[PDB]
Amino acid sequence: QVQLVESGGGLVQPGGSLRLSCAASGFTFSSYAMSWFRQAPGKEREIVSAVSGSGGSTYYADSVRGRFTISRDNSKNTLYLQMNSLRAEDTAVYYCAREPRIPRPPSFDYWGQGTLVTVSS
Q1: Bridge partner residues of 58 (DSSP)
Q2: Domains and CATH numbers, the chain
Q3: DSSP calls for 15-29
Q4: Would you say 117 and 92 are in contact if contact means Cβ atoms under 8 Å apart?
Q5: Can you spell out the DSSP letters for 82-95?
Q6: Which of 22, 19, 23, 24 is nearest to 9 (CA)?
Q7: CB contact at 8 A, 5 and 96
């Protein structure tokens, strides 16, 4: 079975840094694109960043460019999001997802459990 387990994140002061991790198993990791989404209270879930199977191509939402870095380790089967200069607007539950085999639509995503990032004084 495909498994995606998130860790890291948590509580940080404004301006500080956090890293999220997503440990994948049950599939050939490097065969799949991976993404990070977030959902803030009373808002829809929204994409944050994504990365190709090989790691050769990446995508960032405009709101996080320069502050967030996606990466993956294709030997350890782990996905990361490094977040710097965090602000209150970044508080949310963050999810990793495995993007499906081409050309399946997003309903075929597998999702991690979600983990809190909370930026407060």
Answers
A1: 51
A2: 1-121 (2.60.40.10)
A3: T--EEEEEEEESS-G
A4: yes
A5: EE-S--GGG-EEEE
A6: 19
A7: no
One-letter amino acid of 86: L
The Cα angle at residue 36 between residues 32 and 42, in degrees rounded to 5: 140
With 0-12 / 13-18 / 19 or more C-beta atoms within 10 angstroms meaning exposed / middle / buried, residue 2 is exposed
Task: Take residue 36 and report the two structure tokens written for it.
Answer: 């990070």
Return d(Cα 85, Cα 79) in angstroms, integer.
20
Q: Which residue has the tokens 């602000």?
A: 87
Technique employed here was X-ray
Beta bridge partners of 10: 117
Tokens at residue 44, please?
A: 């829809």
Listed resolution, Å: 1.8
Tokens 């993956």 belong to: 72
- For the chain, the residues before each gap (C–N > 2.5 Å) are none
d(CA 67, CA 91) in angstroms, rounded, equals 14
Asked whether the beta carbons of 32 and 41 are under 8 A apart, the reply is no
